[model samples]
Each structure stands twice: as structure tokens, then as C-alpha cells.
Target: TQELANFENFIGATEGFSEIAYQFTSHILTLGYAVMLAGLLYFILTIKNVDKKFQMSNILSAVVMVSAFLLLYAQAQNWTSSFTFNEEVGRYFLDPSGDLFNNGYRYLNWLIDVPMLLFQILFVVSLTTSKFSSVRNQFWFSGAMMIITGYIGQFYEVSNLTAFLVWGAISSAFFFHILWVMKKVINEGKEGISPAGQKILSNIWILFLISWTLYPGAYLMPYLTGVDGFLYSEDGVMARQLVYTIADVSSKVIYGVLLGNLAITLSKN
Candidate 1:
């Protein structure tokens, strides 16, 4: 424990939490894991239902589900172990000698899953090989830039506001680039897809908009709420978890299911 103090850490130190505040976070984490499990089973069972060419999207969904499941489960356990009941204070406090709860797990999970999730859209539209490869390169590269920069920024969330703002600005640039690319896919790339499939693609695009928009908003929520100690307070923690869990399930699992459904539609047409 003494050895670890020299190293800089982010979002791992636990502030004191009321029982309900702590319990709510635990419940959200558990719900996140369970949602991922259900998504995993759905993707796996329907892998072959789509056309062979579009099956890769289904496979990617399963990969994301598995990845999300493991990370959320880890988060759940970490949440459980990171705090201890303080008899004197009637609160759960950081168990300094024990495991720390790192929210970076969610960012890491996004690093793995976001690209694959975006890549699933290409399959839904069933692009030509050269076109597909081009978009793949762009999406994967941009997605990594957006997530990694945001990850770095989040480390400075409470410590260095200037650095956080700059990194977030840079990350949002890449994020906009990806959105532009998606907009193109929606407008120009649907030439090969039937109108039915195209409708689904648009729905997927709107879902992407709604879900991805929630993420940055939620990240900024604690600061924007005008509540002092919001970032450190128990209510802030619980609210943040709730918002993130909803965003995550929507962006990854729900979007993937729609993509899988589109794949089947494309398979038929």
C-alpha cells in the first residue's frame, strides 16, 4: 500500500458514501453485467441467422457483449470490495488497503468495443470491399483517438481543469469526424441497400446519435449540475453510474442488436 501511494491515480479513491448511495451503484453495476450477459446470448444464438456475408456484424456484437460483461463484472466486484463499513461514521469509506474502484475500466471497455460497434454499421449497409476497408480504417482510427484522448482528459477531471478541457476539445474533434463519417454512410453509402434495410440503418444512426450523445453529457454531468461536492458526493456517484450504465447498454448492446437485425434484413433482400 505504501508503495502505491507514490503513483498517481484517478477515480480510484473512494469518498465516503451513504448506504443507499453505495447500494445503488452496486445495483447499477450488477444490472450492467446482466444486460451484457443477455446481449451476449442473443448475439451468439442468432449468429448464423444473418446472411453469411453479414455474419461478421453478429460476431462483433458477441465480442462486445463478452467484453462488456467481463468489464462490468469486474467493476461490480471492484465496487463491492473498494469500500468498507465504518461503524463510527455510519458510512462506507475507502478501504485503503484493499482494492480500488477504477472507472477507467469503462473507458477501456469502450476502447475495445466502440470500434467494433461502429464497424458493425458497415456490415449493416453491406458496402463494397474497397469502400468497406476505407471506412473501417477511418472509423477504427478515429474511434481510438476519441476514446484515448477522452480517457486522458478524464484522469485530469478533478485535478487539472485546463488539461481536461483541452483534451476534451481534441477528443470532441475526432468525435465530430466520426459523426461526419456516419452521416456520409447514411446519405451516400446506402445506394446498395434496399429501402427497408436503409430504414433500419437510419434508425441505427439515430440510436447512435442518442446514445453517444449521452456519454459526453454524462461525463460532464457532475460538473454541470451546479451542485457543490457533486463529483465527490454520494448522489453524484450514484447518478453518474446510472447515466453511464444506460449510455453503455444503449450504445453497445442495443445498437448491436439493431445492426444484427439489419443484417438479417439485408440477408433477405
Candidate 2:
């Protein structure tokens, strides 16, 4: 009820951009999905290379690639369509009646992808069947709450600073919980996997931490800049696309490639 308290008084405040900003954002998102497309192909083509038990990791990677690609593609299109150039004003402005490009979609995308990504860890790390189920429960739960709490707070970005902060802090806690569980998962299986696989797994943990860490940085950009609204606050808008795309590449595409290689490495040993 509190979240829905405002029904009709909302103003349309999306921003238009300079040509350079628009193209940079557009190019980056296109590049992001392109990478995701390539990842989809890589995971599928390499599936047979991994052992049967590890094949699910490749399959899940492929699933994540597809979902990420769709989101990036849609985001690129949404970027182009959401604004109209006002040459007289020498800047693009939100087109009349155009849909706002909500970062919410990416959050929504993360809702599904994060869980799948977390579940993929189970395959790389050897775990008992019951242990697998147990870890999966924590992963799925924390993973989802992390995204949901952040998504909820993101809406408050320009609305309520305190609300945004409260939710952001709550959301961040879930992320720490996720990291602790991930550490536990990796630790549990290190003894069973090959030494090479262990090295890759350790590197993966660091990469995951770095990639996931960038999200809140982007999430807080607007608030930090004290921008009254998104898009209107140019820094908040452009930097976010760049950050999200970079983080997505690391977290989704490259991470999958590394894990796929790890699966193969384990099979050989």
C-alpha cells in the first residue's frame, strides 16, 4: 500500500540526450547483447565436450545467454524509441507518449538469471545430492531477495531517498549472504575437482564478486549525484548503461565461458 500510494500525480520526466550520449549508450547495449548471442552459441556448441553430469551447466549457461540477449536487445531498441530529437533545443527530449526505458527490465531479467547462475555453481563444485539441494535452497532464496529488494528500491531512486536507501541497504545484505553461501559452496567442492579446476573456480569467485559489486554502484549513481530524475541527470543515465553492460559481460558471458572450460578441464582430469 505504501509503494502504491501515488497513483495519478506522477509526472513524466524522462530525459533526452545529446547525439554522442545516445549513440554511446545505444552502441554499448547492442554490443552487450551481441556478446550474449555469441555466448549462447558457445555454450551450446561446447555442451557435448563436457561430461554428462556437467552438461547441465552448459545448458543453463545457454539459457542465461538467451535471456540476457533478449533484455539487451530490447533495451537497445527501447533506448532508440524512447526519445525524439529536438533540434531546436539541440538535445533529445523524451518523446511525447513514449514509454520510459525502465531499468526495471534488467532487474526483472536478473530475477531469473541470477538463480540460474547460482544453480550453475552446483555443477562445478561436487556436492552430495542432499547437500546440493540444501545449497540450492539458500542460493535461490538469497539470489531472488537480492534482486527483489534492489528492484523495489530502484523505483524510489528519484522519489524517496530514504526509501531508496532503506531498500538498498536491505538488498545489499542479501548480496552479502549470497557471497557467503557461494564461498561455502566453492570451499565444499575444492577437494573433489582437479587442481586446474580449483584455480579457475577461485578466479571465478573473485570475478563474480567484482562483477556483482558494480551493480549497486550503478544503482546508487543517481542518488549519489543528487539528480532529481533519471535520464534528466545525464550521468545517472549513460553511466548505468555502460556499467550494466560491462558487468553483464563479466558475470554472464565470460563467467559462463570460464565455467564451460572448467567443465572440460574436469572431464580431462
Candidate 3:
């Protein structure tokens, strides 16, 4: 009973801190997405000579990123409201403490934004060959698979290690498939693509390859340490949230800027 009580106390303290951490990070995410959205909109309206469809892709990606951040901010606010501290006990706890607050916002955001992200780059490259459809389908399909399997793994009630690894492995494979498709599209080259655009595209591909890898790291962080991994506790939950928030901005916002720059470069002579 003492051990159980100690564990409860640990949770109360850590969760209280986690709640605050989420609130802080979520606010930053909100503003970050807002600024990115505005910048991308400016790029879309003012920039010219680039492909119309490519600009539209930037717009879509911006909209989705902003929407995702809005949801995340709301989730954090809701979590803050869900907290209750007992003065006598000297600890904080969630009133419900159900699975409802288990990074559901991030998963929902991913379901929409991840697909849009892939589509944005696809539009920029504008691959057009007999193999176009096949590559496009593979890219989008793999993106969808990654997000879906990731959600399943994240939301599973049981901390099933096998389940996590299996889903992670499958999603990771899909992730690589996307990269392969992008590389193929790059080597083949579209008509409008300039040398600068090609270079930017290659760089974006590599950047994404490196940055997107963080998602799985955050996802698998729990299983990494076995039962004691940070994934299992409130502290781990907050840590995962921070890592994911950073990764989202990197993969979405930074990627957006790079894509926009590529479009601008292509627009020039």
C-alpha cells in the first residue's frame, strides 16, 4: 500500500508539472503556426511565376498546420481546466485522468496534416510521367499508413510493447517508401523545375528524412526503456508532447518555408 501511495504521489506531482509544460508548449505552438500561416499566405498571394498548384500546396499546408495548432492549444487549455489540487494533500491531479487526454489532439492533427504535408511536396515537385500516378499513390498511401498506424499505437489502451513495435515498424516502412518516391521524382525531373529548385528539393528531401525520423523516436521513447521508460508516466507524456511539438514545427513550418523558397527560386529566370 505504501508503494502504491508513493506512486500516486509521484504521478500527482509529475502530472501537475506536465500540465503546466503542455500549456506553455501549446501556447508557443499556437503562435508559431499562426506566424507561419501568415507568412505562407503572403508567399502565395505576392509571389508569382511559380506553378499555381504549388502555391496552393503551400496554402493547404499552412491551413492544416494552423488548424492542428489550434486544436493542440485547445486541448492544453482543456487539460488545464481538468486539473484539481488538494491543499491538504499538496499535490495536483486530473479530475478524470482518463485516456481522453492522451495526446489525442496530436493524433487527430497528424491524421489531417501528415497527408497534407506529403501532398504539398508532391505538388512542388509536380512529377508528370507515366509512372506519376504510381509514385503519387505510393507517396500519399504511405503517408496515410504512417499516420494511421501511429495513431493506433499511440491510442492503444494497453501498453503492449509488441503492438507498439509492430505498428512502428510498419509505419516506418511506409515513411521510407515516401522518401523513395520523392527521390525517384527528383531524379526524373519535371519540366518547370530549375537547377535551384532541384537543389532545394533535394535538400528538402534530406531535411525531411532527418527531421521526420524524430517522430518515431518520440513515439518509441516509451518502449525504449522497457517498463521504466519515460513513455509510461506523466513526465514521459509531457516529454513526448514537447518532442512532438518541436518536430511538427520542423517538419511543417520549416518545410513550408523551404518549399516556398524553392517556388520563388523557380519563378526567377
Structure candidate 2, residue pairs in collision: 16-92
Candidate 3 residue-wise lDDT, 91-139, digit = tens = 4565555322445666777777777777676666666563656766776
lDDT of 2: 0.79
Distance from true location, Cα of 201 in model 2, Å: 0.9
For residue 124, give model 2's deviation from the true position in Å: 1.8
> Candidate 3's C-alpha lDDT?
0.64
Looking at model 1, which ten-residue stretch has the lowest summed lDDT?
1-10
Lowest lDDT block of 10, candidate 2: 3-12
Give the Cα lDDT of each candidate: 0.79, 0.79, 0.64
Regions of candidate 3 where Cα sits further than 4 Å from its true position: 1-53, 97-100, 128-130, 189-193, 229-235
In candidate 3, the residue pairs with backbone N, CA or C atoms under 3 Å apart (3 or more residues apart, or in different chains) clash, namely: none
Q: Rank the candidates by TM-score, best first.
A: 2, 1, 3
Give lDDT: candidate 3, residue 151: 72
- For each of the candidates, the C-alpha root-mean-square deviation to the true structure, in angstroms, is 3.3, 4.0, 4.5
Superior by TM-score: candidate 1 or candidate 2? 2
